[PDB]
Every structure is written in C-alpha cells, then in structure tokens.
Amino acid sequence: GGDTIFGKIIRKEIPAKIIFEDDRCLAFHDISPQAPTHFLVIPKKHISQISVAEDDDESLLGHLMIVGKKCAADLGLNKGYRMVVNEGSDGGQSVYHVHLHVLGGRQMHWPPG
Amino acid sequence: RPGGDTIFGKIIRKEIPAKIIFEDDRCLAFHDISPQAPTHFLVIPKKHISQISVAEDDDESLLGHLMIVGKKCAADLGLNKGYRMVVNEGSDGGQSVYHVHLHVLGGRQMHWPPG
C-alpha cells in the first residue's frame, strides 16, 4: 500500500467513503472535494508518481481509467466529467501515491488549472 | 479512413499538419494548437474511440499506453518540475473533439481546482 495516507486507506486503517474495490485498485470519495462529485481511483501497488511508472504498469494505469469511468456512470455523471493525474510540484501532486481524480456534477472550466 | 474524420483522425493520417513529438503503432503525441501552459501536448490513440465513457474493457492497455507515452514525452521535453494530465469527458468535462485525447501540461505551476 505504501508509506502515505493512501496506503492507510488501502489497508483500512483510516476510514474513507469507498465507491469500488477490486484486487488491484480502490475508488473513494475525495476528502476535500472540488466538485459536487469528486473521487479518486488509486492502485493498490505503491507507485509514487506517474513519472516512475514502468511499461509493465500500462494495463494497471488503464484499469484505473476504466474503473474511473464506470464509477462515474454509477454515480450518475451523465453530462460528463474530468479526469486528472498530477505529477510533481508543478503538477500540484498532493500525495506521493499515484491517483486519478474524477470530478463532475458541475461545468469544468478551461484552462484545467 | 482509419482513425475517423475528426481533426485528430486527419492528423493521424497526415492530411492536416501537426507538430509531432512521438509516434508508434498505437498512438501519436503532438503539440496543442492553443496551449494553456508553456508546454501543452496531446496523446491520442490511433484507434478511434469517441470518448472515455465508451471505452471498452479491452482498451485498458491502450489507455495506459497513452499515459506512459505522456510521461515519457514529458521527460524528453524537460518537464522536470512536473506536469498535469487531463482527460475531458462530454459537455461538463469540456470535451470539444470526440476522439479520445490525453492532455499533458507543464512548464508552469498548475493550480487547484483543475478548472
């Protein structure tokens, strides 16, 4: 799981509002939401940041996006939504465990930050 | 015509020019014509998928390949302080071209919320 708060969430050591879980990822609502619906999809494998993901991680990263879009449909986001991965300081990455943001329920604007 | 006839299908088939960063059998990376950051490029599959909400379960590897190519191109472009990847879905997501595309933006501090 890793040495971050997201590792604690994976290990069920602190609570989170879990939306979906399987053997390789976990989706849960963001504790500081930026849209009426704002959740995260994270791998259970501790990849600290997208910049260090290996080629063998391709299917896992794609799995996060497929889970993300299936959860978005399940949460009723039929008008659309935005998916975000942050990397590093300029990207605004807040936890050094790879995570996919999914935001919806309001108009998302341009530029995306 | 393989890839469809959105602007991105035309770019895939070299019918409309673009500033290409990387190309392989599965995807194409090229700079955005209206950049929202000092570096702003797109990674698209060559397979036509209109939007992420209709991607199939067996598109997992392809979607992940977009992100791996995105981060490898970011490194090759010297985005050593980081970057943001964005996929827009539908009207609320701000989608304007219905051929799946991953944005990669960097070269400045990105703000929160992401739009």
Count the residues in chain A: 113
CA distance A32 to A53: 26
**Given CB atoms, is B58 within the 8 Å cutoff of chain A?**
no
Interface probe with B: pick from A45, A51, A96, most Cβ of B within 10 Å: A51
Query: Per DSSP, what are the bridge partners of residue A73?
Result: none
Q: Based on the number of CB atoms within 10 Å of its own CB, is A25 exposed (0-12), middle (13-18) or buried (19 or more)?
A: buried
| Cα-to-chain-centroid distance, residue A52 | 17
Interface probe with B: pick from A67, A78, A87, most Cβ of B within 10 Å: A87
**A38: part of which helix (H) or strand (E)?**
strand A37-43
Residues in B touching A87 (Cβ below 8 Å): 71, 74, 82-85
CA distance B11 to A69: 26
Contact A113 B71 (CB under 8 A): no
CA distance A102 to B93: 10
Q: Based on the number of CB atoms within 10 Å of its own CB, is A79 exposed (0-12), middle (13-18) or buried (19 or more)?
A: middle
CB-closest option in A35, A80, A88 to B83:
A88
Structure-solving method? X-ray
Contact B90 A81 (CB under 8 A): yes
Residues 6+ away with beta carbon under 8 Å from B27: B43, B44, B45, B46, B62, B65, B66, B69
Per-residue CA distances from A4 to A1, A29, A41 (Å): 8, 17, 15
**Given CB atoms, is B92 within the 8 Å cutoff of chain A?**
yes
**A8: part of which helix (H) or strand (E)?**
helix A5-10
CA distance B31 to A87: 19
Residues in A touching B86 (Cβ below 8 Å): 82-84, 112
CA distance A7 to B2: 43
CB B53 within 8 Å of CB B90: yes
Find the angle CA(B40)-CA(B77)-CA(B47) to the nearest 5 degrees.
Answer: 60
**Given CB atoms, is A41 within the 8 Å cutoff of chain B?**
no
B67 SS3 class: helix
**Given CB atoms, is B77 within the 8 Å cutoff of chain A?**
no
**Given CB atoms, is A84 within the 8 Å cutoff of chain B?**
yes
Find the angle CA(B111)-CA(A85)-CA(B55) to the nearest 5 degrees.
Answer: 130
CA distance B82 to A64: 21
Q: Domains in chain A, ordered, with CATH?
A: 1-113 (3.30.428.10)
